[model samples]
Target: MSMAMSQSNRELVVDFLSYKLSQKGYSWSQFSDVEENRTEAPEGTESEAVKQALREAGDEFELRYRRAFSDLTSQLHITPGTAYQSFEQVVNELFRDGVNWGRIVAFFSFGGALCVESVDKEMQVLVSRIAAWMATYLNDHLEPWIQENGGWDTFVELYGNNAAAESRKGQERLEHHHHHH
Candidate 1:
């Protein structure tokens, strides 16, 4: 079973993601930083909350599937030249059935894996490009589905409270299934 992500780990993922997106000219306003908003704004400001929830979801997915993600990267042998193509093919296959939370988690894991592999290979330049590719995919393909599904607010409501425990079981099942295969 998986363990809960520590506060430090959560911050690590959030910081990494923010930094990568920032490098790609993505303004911070798009994904508001929850930590800096401690002053508490007025009512009806749900957009920032939604963005923060999405970032939390990203952190959860990246940590939950860390091992599997690394394994995927190791097996894929993706190079910067082929990274986009490979990402497209793999993500398209993952979304063939349609978008769901699990598949969305997988998408995050895939992007995280690509970034990790790029750094490991000393091709740090690919990190920002990979981040941009992921952002593009989210904006173009996943945003519609996300909005229809009640956006990140609904996602947070569904998976925020007990995601750590739930993901532990999921991780175990995934590992078990992989072992049999």
Candidate 2:
């Protein structure tokens, strides 16, 4: 189901990606001011809204898959030296069947798993490298598919709505606790 979005919406996807990467400590800006880097974005309310929604989508996606991701990482030992190679191999296999939102989220989870593993091993340096590798893979390989499939807007529509629904359920659970007490 491809939505007909304006050209500007597609551009928002680009900005959203850059913003998302920057959130994870990837610097896309030209300035060397590290202090203001992560929170900075191009000045526009619409773009900010898009970034927020996509960010929530990613966050919820990761949260939903946390257990499975932990289990997967437990089965494999990833080191800094083999991180990129493993990423390339796994992501290539994921894309072999074709691109979809589920696989995309899985890709993110895999990157996150690698970062977690890196930090667990006291190799914090690989965290940045893993993030870079993920960004590069998305831009180089997945961006075209993402653009053709109606960009990040569609992703937010699908997964972001789930986040809303999930939060609503969480609120209900909270209320249920109140009743119990």
Candidate 3:
């Protein structure tokens, strides 16, 4: 709900994901397939013609995704802002004022679903393998431990602090002017 991280860390996360997705492919068709395949639901789709099947996915997919995510959050007792913040750093950093909020949310939501859906497949194995190797190497393997030490807010601030943080440095709240805090 707040700019919980610093701009640098947020940028790191965005960059990491951008690079990750780049390697995974971000073309229209690839994006569509990645999004569709990421979900656990069946939609009469196994493979698409190209990467642009998303253009035809319509709001049907978005509505379904929102419902599914809504259910997921309710089950986890997590707030929606927290859930979307998983990828908000992308919008916060990459776009400017003229951006379309709904489309942005929709696009990244698609990506987020894919990122999670890949967990059982290459993602889990890739991350686990990386973690294992990193554990063997990095001295500060602190993520798993220090996570709740305010990682969410911290990461929020770490990335999205730029536009809001600069003018409002030490201003008590990030973007919500007339502070409720």
Q: What are the per-residue Cα lDDT tens digits for candidate 3 across 69-109?
A: 45432332222233334333333332345333233334433
Two-way lDDT contest, 1 vs 3, winner: 1
**lDDT, model 3:** 0.35
At residue 18, give the lDDT of candidate 2: 49
45-104 in candidate 1: lDDT tens per residue? 333343345556666666766665554555457553576777677667557788976676
TM-score of 2: 0.55
lDDT of 2 by residue, 13-84 (tens): 345444554555553343222354454666544533344555565566677666655555554466525666
Which stretch of 10 consecutive residues in model 2 shows the poorest summed lDDT?
2-11
Full-model lDDT for every candidate: 0.57, 0.57, 0.35
- Model 1, TM vs. native: 0.54
Tell me how far the alpha carbon of residue 78 in candidate 3 is from the true structure, in angstroms, after superposition: 40
